[PDB]
Write an enzyme that holds these catalytic residues in place. Structure first.
Site, PDB file in Angstrom:
ATOM      1  N   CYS A  14     -34.990  63.564  14.217  1.00  0.00           N
ATOM      2  CA  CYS A  14     -34.352  63.038  13.022  1.00  0.00           C
ATOM      3  C   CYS A  14     -35.456  62.472  12.114  1.00  0.00           C
ATOM      4  O   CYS A  14     -35.859  62.834  11.252  1.00  0.00           O
ATOM      5  CB  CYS A  14     -32.890  62.577  13.129  1.00  0.00           C
ATOM      6  SG  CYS A  14     -31.725  63.830  13.621  1.00  0.00           S
ATOM      7  N   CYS A  17     -40.660  59.339  12.750  1.00  0.00           N
ATOM      8  CA  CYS A  17     -41.315  58.135  12.903  1.00  0.00           C
ATOM      9  C   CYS A  17     -42.730  58.254  13.032  1.00  0.00           C
ATOM     10  O   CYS A  17     -43.030  59.056  14.005  1.00  0.00           O
ATOM     11  CB  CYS A  17     -40.685  57.010  13.899  1.00  0.00           C
ATOM     12  SG  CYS A  17     -38.966  56.940  13.603  1.00  0.00           S
TER      13      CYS A  17
END
Length: 85
Positions: A14, A17
């Site tokens: 999701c 990073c």
């Protein structure tokens, strides 16, 4: 006496990073040589970190200590390995 070992045991999917890219840049600021980074995107590799006492991604090692702090990677401790690892 093993150099500062970082490991990045997660495949965040999701939030894309920087993960090991932050953790390496952050500790290489401190130690631009005594740094080891296992970027192990969690796929096609053993659960050798996802065992431990944590058993909870994102599974992250800083200096050598095994932990997980947040939905992202170990940013709470990254704010402190930057300070005085």
């Amino acid at each position: 006496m093993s150099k500062v070992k970082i490991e990045l045991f997660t495949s965040p999917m999701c939030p894309h990073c920087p993960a090991a890219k932050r953790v390496v840049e952050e500790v290489a600021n401190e130690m631009p040589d005594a740094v080891e980074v296992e970027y192990i995107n969690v796929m096609e590799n053993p659960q050798k970190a996802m065992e431990y006492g944590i058993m909870a991604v994102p599974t992250i090692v800083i200096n050598g200590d095994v932990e997980f702090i947040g939905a992202p990677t170990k940013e709470a401790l990254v704010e402190a390995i930057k300070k005085r690892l």
